[PDB]
Amino acid sequence: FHLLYHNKSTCAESTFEPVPIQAKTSPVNEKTLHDQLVLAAEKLEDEDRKRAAQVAMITNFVGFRMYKMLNEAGSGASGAILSPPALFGTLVSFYLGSLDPTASQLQTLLDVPVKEGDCTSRLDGHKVLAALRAVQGLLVTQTPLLQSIVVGLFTAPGFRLKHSFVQSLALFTPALFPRSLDLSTDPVLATEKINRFIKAVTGWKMNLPLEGVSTDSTLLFNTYVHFQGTMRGFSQLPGVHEFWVDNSISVSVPMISGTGNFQHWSDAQNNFSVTCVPLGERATLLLIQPHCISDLDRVEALIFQDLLTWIENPPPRAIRLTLPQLEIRGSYNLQDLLAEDKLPTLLGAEANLNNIGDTNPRVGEVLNSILLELKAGEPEALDVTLSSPFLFAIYEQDSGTLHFLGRVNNPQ
């Protein structure tokens, strides 16, 4: 990963109190962000594309790792979903705000050795978030794919953020909202305000956890991801259809169906099958179905383990793929997943994050919150039908990045 480290030349503070959460705020413009993200991806050189490749490996490794900690933490009845790039960026943001021992420990969490007595063995956050942004650019370049990330920095009254830190965050995403609110006096009310505010500026209907945060918190970092996919040549089927959550629970849900030349195969060794449909010239949706429902866990553990070498490329074939229209939501506190990962205080009262503000923040939650949407774009083939729980993943052929991976036990 040499292109992610500080160079020999690289090895050589104004603050502010964020405006009150109440303050009037022009909403996000998802298509103004998208048009800028296109620009970014199209100016990329050969150096840039190599970095993208390198950063993707760190992202994928860390992604699986934390998805496993997610399912050990319990993800909920509906299923689970994770954006490694969103996750990765969040941890890199904190890396950029940290000093040793945290700074090193964080790097070690990203499987990047910290050679003691070596600046050049340190990750360059700025270079990394740049490369990370490239990979996001590559995903969305008819506009069939749309992904928008917005970060909310929610500070306790009085606590001041360093402008340098926020500068660094802009690389990860410009859609960046630092606001101040009383987190101590009524923690439950404060959670309503953060949820109200996010829906007001993004216009996104999302998991709104109502569980308050710690009363002594002075900083809340929250990442919000919103993905929209259009499956071209797929149409919504008449009426609704049964999706068997298990032998004794049905949910009626709208399906979408498409006929195309897709790759498909059955792993007879491990009792599951896979389909690979493209989402544009780059992106690819993977759909894994266990041959039997009581095997979901095992197949999930087995297939989301990092080298993804079971992705076999056979010739495409006529496939009538039918699946539920997806409107997935998921939300979790990164602190919990590390806590399951056994280094509970990695971003814990003991963390050295003295480059975030003019005092060392007490971090109350590091939330990733997801909304994924996959929808309809408008003789004899092989019918593939997802009417029971399955796993999915959006993979990107050029960066090799797993932008999404999760499980669908039930669709709203």
Highlighted features:
alpha+beta; nine-stranded mixed beta sheet; 412 residues; glycoprotein; 31% strand; hormone; 18 strands; Alpha-1-antitrypsin, domain 1; 9 helices; monomer; Antithrombin, Chain I, domain 2; 2 domains
Helices and strands, with pairings:
Layout: E1 15-16, H1 30-42, H2 46-73, E2 79-82, H3 84-96, H4 102-109, H5 125-139, E3 145-155, E4 161-162, H6 163-172, E5 176-180, H7 187-202, E6 219-231, E7 234-236, E8 241-246, E9 249-253, E10 255-267, E11 272-279, E12 283-290, H8 296-303, E13 317-324, E14 326-333, H9 334-340, E15 363-376, E16 382-385, E17 390-396, E18 402-408
Parallel strand pairs: 3-5, 6-15, 13-16
Antiparallel strand pairs: 1-4, 2-18, 3-6, 7-10, 8-9, 10-11, 10-13, 11-12, 12-17, 14-15, 17-18
Helix pairs in contact: 1-5, 2-3, 2-5, 2-9, 3-4, 3-5, 3-6, 5-6
Function: Essential component of the renin-angiotensin system (RAS), a potent regulator of blood pressure, body fluid and electrolyte homeostasis.
Keywords: Disulfide bond, Glycoprotein, Secreted, Signal, Vasoactive, Vasoconstrictor
Protein name: Angiotensinogen
Descriptive report:
The chain has 412 residues and is an alpha+beta fold. It folds into 2 domains: 55-83 and 233-325 and 379-412, Alpha-1-antitrypsin, domain 1, CATH 2.30.39.10; 84-232 and 326-378, 2-Layer Sandwich (Antithrombin, Chain I, domain 2), CATH 3.30.497.10. It has 9 helices and 18 strands. Strands 2, 7, 10, 11, 12, 13, 16, 17 and 18 form a 9-stranded mixed β-sheet that branches. It has a 5-stranded mixed β-sheet with strand order 5-3-6-15-14, sandwiched between helices. Strand 10 (255-267) and strand 11 (272-279) form a beta hairpin. Helix 2 packs across helix 3, helix 2 (46-73) packs across helix 5 (125-139) and helix 3 runs antiparallel to helix 5 (125-139). It is globular, with a radius of gyration of 22 Å. Glycans are attached at residues 7, 271, 352. Keywords: Disulfide bond, Glycoprotein, Secreted, Signal, Vasoactive, Vasoconstrictor. Its main location: secreted.
